[PDB]
Amino acid sequence: KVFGRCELAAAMKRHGLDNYRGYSLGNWVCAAKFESNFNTQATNRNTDGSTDYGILQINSRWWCNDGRTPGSRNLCNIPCSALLSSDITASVNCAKKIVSDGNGMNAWVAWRNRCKGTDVQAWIRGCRL
């Protein structure tokens, strides 16, 4: 599913991400934009052999099981394919664990390089939330 910007903002708000660990909604929308282009089916292979899955590009090195990432963890206790659903519940719940790990949203390289320090409120401008 390719979400609209405001549609995804509404879903992320409903699932409790607005100001989760102090990150406003705009941070999450900005992150999804530059990770996945708001596409739940997005997958990308990392150099280390792991893969990133879904709207927030969650990595099989640590968070999910995709059956092909040796010596990795599954800290969200889910198959990576759950992260490609039209329903973002699994992505959001796993994201909450990630952002709680100690590094906050720096875990998402696209967030650190493209969203951090910017006017992220722009990502939810116009949206009925």
Binding site members for substrate: 101
Out of Cl ion, Na ion, none, what residue 50 binds, judged by CB under 5 to 8 A for its kind, is none
Alpha helices in 1-129 (DSSP H): 5-14, 25-36, 89-99, 109-114
For residue 79, state whether it binds Cl ion (rule: CB under 5 A): no
Residues 72-111: x/- map of binding to Na ion (CB under 5 A)? x-x-------------------------------------
Q: How far apart are CA 114 and CA 61, in angstroms?
A: 23
CA distance 1 to 106: 26
Q: Is 7 in the active site?
A: no
Question: What spatial distance separates the first Cα and last Cα of the chain, rounded to whole Å?
Answer: 20
Binders of Cl ion among residues 80 to 109 (CB under 5 A) are 104
Can you give the binding site for Na ion, defined by CB under 5 A? 60, 65, 69, 72, 74
